[PDB]
Amino acid sequence: HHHHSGESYPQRQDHELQALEAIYGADFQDLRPDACGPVKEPPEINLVLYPQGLTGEEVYVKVDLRVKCPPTYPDVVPEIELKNAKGLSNESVNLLKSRLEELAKKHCGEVMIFELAYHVQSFLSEHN
Amino acid sequence: HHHHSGESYPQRQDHELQALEAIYGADFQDLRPDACGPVKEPPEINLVLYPQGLTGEEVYVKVDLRVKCPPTYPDVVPEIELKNAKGLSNESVNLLKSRLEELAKKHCGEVMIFELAYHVQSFLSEHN
């Protein structure tokens, strides 16, 4: 009745955060403060995302992907927010948020932030 | 004229392998032998993939995702192969391979093995 990997929800979430930091690096940020105790707060991360395959150093379209993973993630959808949108209209931001929440529902059962991030990168490329 | 991350192709490929090992763990395998010299062969990995959100311990449909990344990856598509297919017909395996190579073409410019792996997991769930 448990996931085939045999890992708990915190281990699956912690492994995804390590994977996100390895690929995105400085564009990834764990917004949780350094806890002096043994309790780990639910992960809240920020991903600065650019159009797919962006080159150079001059950006025109970008947005920050704010993801808060509840304890039952990824068996439940995470809290998705879009911040610091640049070069996007209000209708395009609402559309992207609706598509991400729709993607998150179909992605339940597996960690999904990598798929949400690529969906944003592909979306930004279509509006660039 | 270079990627916005400022990282080279080997660094982007090595970061993806570290991310893949963190999430998939034992289902991920680097098929490159341990080189005693300083030259790193092109990454050739194997991903044992199951239907999305598979529970229990009894598997019915599964396949291994064989990916070989050329030096210019991800600016060029990687070599994709499907091995050890279980519960899938020959037509379904050829379809999955065609969809993965189509996905890889649209994903050029960013690392894509995570998107290829989820596409397989979602595909296996539709044939389960």
From Swiss-Prot, chains A, B:
Top-rank lineage group of the source organism: Eukaryota
Domain (RWD) ranges: 15-127
Expression across tissues: Widely expressed. Expressed in lung, smooth muscle cells and macrophages.
Localization of this protein: Cytoplasm
Role this protein plays: Metabolic-stress sensing protein kinase that phosphorylates the alpha subunit of eukaryotic translation initiation factor 2 (EIF2S1/eIF-2-alpha) in response to low amino acid availability. Plays a role as an activator of the integrated stress response (ISR) required for adaptation to amino acid starvation.
Family recorded in the similarity comment: Belongs to the protein kinase superfamily. Ser/Thr protein kinase family. GCN2 subfamily.
Domain statement: The histidyl-tRNA synthetase-like region and protein kinase domains are necessary for eIF-2-alpha kinase activity and eIF-2-alpha-mediated translational control. The histidyl-tRNA synthetase-like domain is necessary for binding to uncharged tRNAs. Kinase domain 1 is a degenerate kinase domain.
Disorder noted: Pulmonary venoocclusive disease 2, autosomal recessive: A disease characterized by widespread fibrous obstruction and intimal thickening of septal veins and preseptal venules, a low diffusing capacity for carbon monoxide, occult alveolar hemorrhage, and nodular ground-glass opacities, septal lines and lymph node enlargement showed by high-resolution computed tomography of the chest. It is frequently associated with pulmonary capillary dilatation and proliferation, and is a rare and devastating cause of pulmonary hypertension.
Quaternary assembly: Homodimer; homodimerization is important for kinase activation by uncharged tRNAs. Interacts with GCN1; this interaction stimulates EIF2AK4/GCN2 kinase activity and is impaired by IMPACT upon a variety of stress conditions, such as amino acid depletion, UV-C irradiation, proteasome inhibitor treatment and glucose deprivation. Interacts with DNAJC3; this interaction inhibits EIF2AK4/GCN2 kinase activity during endoplasmic reticulum (ER), hypothermic and amino acid-starving stress conditions. Interacts with MAP3K20; activates EIF2AK4/GCN2 kinase activity in response to moderate ribotoxic stress. (Microbial infection) Interacts with hepatitis E virus (HEV) ORF1 protease; this interaction inhibits dimerization of EIF2AK4 and prevents EIF2AK4-mediated phosphorylation of EIF2A.
Name recorded for this polypeptide: eIF-2-alpha kinase GCN2
Portion of the full-length sequence here: 17 to 138 of 1649
